């Protein structure tokens, strides 16, 4: 379409309008323009091309194949920056990315309640404020292949809020210990469990309880008797919430049996007095609470 | 009384195959056989007032509704049924619908039928739990154990003795296991919980995909892929999730990332055949996921939440059972979206 | 007025939601049209079956999970609804059927008929190894001319000759055309056979009918065999 | 197989979950399986007659 001086001339810059006056001249209104499918000359986009880009064009002054200025007349003088900075927002983010402004500052217990809330549900503000976590034991094993030994880190952990859930978590890791620990972590979390407590301090009576070749012989204790437990089972009472302990262990003293043997016998060695008074239709009276009482 | 009126179109459809006929005719014959001859005679003419009407108005008309009109935008029944001549044979295809309205109408006189068993009403006309008796249960087959070699000893309690060489099932407490595990169904309907129907035994799907449709559920009858519960970030969070309002009407809401990657674990887990889904129960325990399945002779009972003691072989008695559960469920979807209405 | 967030598919818990759901559509549909007769056209083997590749279905049926065999199932059904008679069928299986059809009609052929010339006269190119030949086939009566000479002057085998007159003799027709044959390039051999060739081509025009008797004799296949370059 | 105990204490083990906070919502079925007991016992019971003679 040919058009007349006026409207060409609001829109397009003056020094621009002689070359559309000659090209509406040479060019006859009837042309059929034909679509070339071998060369592409045109982008791909729609563009009158009267405006320099500064990054899809050729920077003004710098020296390039086309730079239209002579050898003695460029513009730039300063090299310590990249001349034309990405266009737009400025970066190339991948949609879905986010840029590393800050790195080595998370909290691998906010890493590790994250992941557990997508894959379990578990609320966050639990795991990262109201658990404690204490690894009870970290070595080194080792596989031997036909290439050689691998050396992988073992790591078992015990959380707890200490508020009567405790679980126990194990980790590997061929890599680092660190990322062994956060496994085990991990696990602990999925393996949280409430233990029975009598007066939210100690166990109901006594127990006596086998782990594979570890004998557990744990009792009751009065308030303000502290801990007096092999190491591997005063860690567990301090996340379980237990306060007040005695026991001792025979035969075996591994220490990873005896952290699952306690954490067994917590749950399946115990029964609360409301258990029992139900089971067999009965009261039980705790003759010490009664004494102070009304 | 009103048949003229299909008379009248036929009378133009018949005209058009005959204007159209005759078009194709025309295309043939050679330009110079007609052309020629045809501009002749208007050269050898003169147009009148009259011919020069349409001289315009035809152009127009065809400059109006075949050059400026837009090529496109931005009988209901068998309506590609080619009707054959009166005087013809009736074609293969409107002797199908010819035996199809007789069979709507004559096909089914003489006598009714009653007291006959039809095994697709078991999906789609289910009882409600409370009509359920020992003689329909029976009628089904759940009574029918396993055989006395397979026992699993656990399961002594609803035995209710052995009959040629398998244990009898003692419908007694399989009614009263049924109406509980109905219950749990409807509760978790009418709280809008996500009930998920498992059952991967050859022709089971059509009863599952009902009891999911019925009952706004979920259903699995391929294969339960192991992990699907505690590993589902890596299994089911590529599958699309969705918001819907109590009236389980699609919200349209778009889904923050964050929100569709989250666990969707389901609130209820029926199970058809718990023996061959070992992975699923365990999964159900470890996730504390609620979990029904119809507990056979040879089947641990205590692997599930509410045990429905029955016969799991027979399709009859696993779709009868799922019917009624499916109803159950059914009636706690159409309680919960009346409370809304009012 | 509570908003919860489900599962949109009811075969969310499957190994492939998306592929088991397409399945279910279709399975609908075969259900409740089951009485509908199909084509007794599918005996004369109507050419019609424009279904999306494997990998098109991918991205609707659930990408890596689609299996070849959920592929093929999905085959057997949309091919089943295609196949009821066109007279009997519905909009609603037109419709679920439309999404599986392979996407060619913004798109147009690019093949035209061919047609005799302003002289009556078949033109068709044949190759063989480096050789090229273009006839001129016209209705006749035998007379043959290659590159202005006679035949038994321009090929002195007679095998040579007997392979230009194959497709002549395969539709009985060597004493109804003329041929002007033009070759370049090669040897005789390679000459006479694109010859051949080219005449096989050009004979097409003249009874389209004819195409698979041309087609079976083997003389309207291009011959590939070429010098290779040992390796 | 032993008596399992996870499969019908899923109430009670999500219990504890809530008082704690580790579950911040409510399960939809934890009101309908408090009000419906699971049945716990897994007794073998005797009998005293053939019901068929
Ligand atoms: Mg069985």
Redesign the interface.
């Known amino acids: 379409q040919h058009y007349d001086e006026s409207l060409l001339s609001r829109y397009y810059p003056e020094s621009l309008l002689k070359s559309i006056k000659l090209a509406q001249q040479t060019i006859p209104e009837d042309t059929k323009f034909r679509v070339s499918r071998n060369v592409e000359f045109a982008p791909p986009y729609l563009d009158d091309f009267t405006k320099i880009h500064p990054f899809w064009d050729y920077k003004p002054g710098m020296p390039h194949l086309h730079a239209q200025e002579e050898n003695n007349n460029f513009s730039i003088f300063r090299w310590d920056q990249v001349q034309q900075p990405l266009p737009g927002e400025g970066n190339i983010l991948p949609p879905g990315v986010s840029l590393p402004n800050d790195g080595g500052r998370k909290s691998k217990s906010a890493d590790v309640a994250a992941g557990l809330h997508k894959q379990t549900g578990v609320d966050p503000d639990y795991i990262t404020r109201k658990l404690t976590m204490k690894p009870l034991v970290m070595k080194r094993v080792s596989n031997q292949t036909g290439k050689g030994k691998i050396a992988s880190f073992y790591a078992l952990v015990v959380v707890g809020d200490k508020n009567g859930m405790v679980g126990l978590g194990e980790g590997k890791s061929r890599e680092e210990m660190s990322k062994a620990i956060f496994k085990a972590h991990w696990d602990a979390v999925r393996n949280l469990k409430e233990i029975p407590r009598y007066e939210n301090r100690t166990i109901y009576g006594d127990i006596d309880f086998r782990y594979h070749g570890v004998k557990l012989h744990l009792r009751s204790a009065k308030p303000g008797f502290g801990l007096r437990v092999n190491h591997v089972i005063f860690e567990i009472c301090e996340c379980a919430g237990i306060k007040d302990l005695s026991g001792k262990v025979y035969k075996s003293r591994n220490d990873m049996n005896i952290a699952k043997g306690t954490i067994e016998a917590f749950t399946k060695a115990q029964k609360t007095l409301d258990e029992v008074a139900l089971g067999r239709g009965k009261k039980l009276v705790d003759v010490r609470k009664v004494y102070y009482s009304s | 009384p009103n048949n003229n009126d299909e008379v009248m179109l036929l009378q133009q459809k018949l005209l058009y195959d005959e204007i159209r006929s005759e078009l194709k005719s025309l295309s043939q014959v050679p330009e110079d056989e007609i052309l020629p001859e045809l501009k002749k005679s208007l050269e050898q003419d003169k147009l009148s007032d009259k011919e020069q009407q349409l001289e315009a108005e035809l152009s127009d008309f065809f400059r109006n509704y075949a050059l400026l009109n837009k090529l496109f935008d931005s009988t209901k029944?068998?309506?590609?049924?080619?009707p054959s001549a009166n005087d013809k044979p009736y074609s293969?295809?409107e002797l199908?619908?010819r035996q199809?309205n007789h069979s709507m109408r004559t096909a089914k006189l003489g006598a009714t039928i009653s007291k006959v068993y039809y095994p697709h009403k078991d999906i789609f006309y289910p009882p409600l739990p409370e009509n359920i008796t020992v003689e329909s249960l029976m009628s089904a087959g759940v009574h029918l154990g396993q055989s006395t070699s397979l026992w699993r000893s656990s399961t002594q309690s609803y035995i209710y003795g052995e009959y040629k060489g398998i244990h009898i099932i003692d419908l007694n407490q399989t009614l009263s296991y049924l109406k509980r595990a109905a219950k749990v169904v409807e509760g978790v309907s009418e709280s809008?919980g996500?009930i998920?129907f498992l059952g991967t035994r050859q022709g089971q799907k059509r009863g599952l995909?009902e009891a999911?449709?019925k009952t706004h559920?979920?259903?699995?009858?391929?294969?339960w892929?192991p992990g699907?519960l505690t590993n589902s970030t890596e299994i089911?969070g590529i599958?699309?999730?969705?918001?819907?309002?109590?009236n389980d009407n699609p919200?349209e809401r778009a889904?923050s990332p964050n929100?569709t990657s989250?666990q969707?674990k389901?609130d209820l887990l029926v199970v058809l055949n718990p023996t061959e889904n070992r992975n699923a129960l365990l999964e159900a325990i470890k996730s504390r996921v609620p979990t029904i399945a119809i507990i056979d002779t040879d089947s641990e009972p205590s692997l599930v939440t509410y045990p429905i003691p029955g016969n799991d072989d027979s399709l009859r008695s696993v779709n009868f059972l799922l019917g009624v559960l499916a109803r159950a469920g059914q009636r706690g979807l159409q309680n919960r979206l009346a409370r809304?209405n009012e | 007025?509570?908003?919860?967030?489900?599962?949109?598919?009811?075969?969310?818990?499957?190994?492939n939601?998306?592929h088991?759901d397409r399945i279910?559509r279709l399975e609908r549909l075969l259900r409740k049209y089951i009485?509908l007769?199909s084509q007794?056209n599918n005996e004369a083997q109507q050419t019609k079956a424009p279904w999306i590749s494997f990998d098109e279905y991918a991205l609707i049926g659930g990408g890596t999970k689609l299996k070849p065999t959920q592929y093929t199932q999905l085959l057997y059904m949309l091919n089943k609804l295609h196949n009821i008679?066109?007279?009997?069928?519905?909009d609603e299986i037109t419709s679920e059927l439309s999404q599986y059809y392979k996407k060619s009609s913004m798109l147009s052929n690019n093949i035209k008929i061919k047609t005799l010339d302003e002289f009556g006269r078949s033109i068709a190119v044949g190759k063989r190894k480096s050789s090229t030949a273009k006839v001129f086939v016209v209705r006749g009566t035998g007379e043959i001319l290659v590159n202005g000479r006679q035949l038994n002057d321009y090929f002195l085998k007679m095998k040579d000759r007997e392979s230009i007159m194959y497709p002549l003799q395969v539709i009985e027709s060597v004493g109804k055309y003329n041929i002007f044959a033009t070759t370049s390039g090669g040897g005789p051999t390679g000459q006479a056979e694109s010859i051949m060739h080219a005449i096989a081509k050009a004979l097409v025009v003249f009874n389209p009918l004819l195409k698979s008797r041309l087609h079976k004799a083997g003389v309207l296949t291009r011959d590939y065999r070429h010098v290779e370059r040992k390796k | 197989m032993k008596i399992q105990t996870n499969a019908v204490n899923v109430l009670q083990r999500t219990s504890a979950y809530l008082k704690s906070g580790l579950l911040k919502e409510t399960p939809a079925w934890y009101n309908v399986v408090a009000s419906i007991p699971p049945s716990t016992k897994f007794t073998r019971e005797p009998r005293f007659k053939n019901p068929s003679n």
């Open positions: 029944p068998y309506p590609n049924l080619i293969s295809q199908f619908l199809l809008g996500i998920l995909e999911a449709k559920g979920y259903y699995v009858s391929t294969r892929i699907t089911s599958w699309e999730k969705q918001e819907i309002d109590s919200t889904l929100e989250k969707v389901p809304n | 007025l509570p908003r919860r967030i489900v599962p949109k598919l009811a075969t969310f818990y499957s190994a939601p998306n088991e279910n009485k007769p007794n008679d066109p007279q009997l069928t519905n």
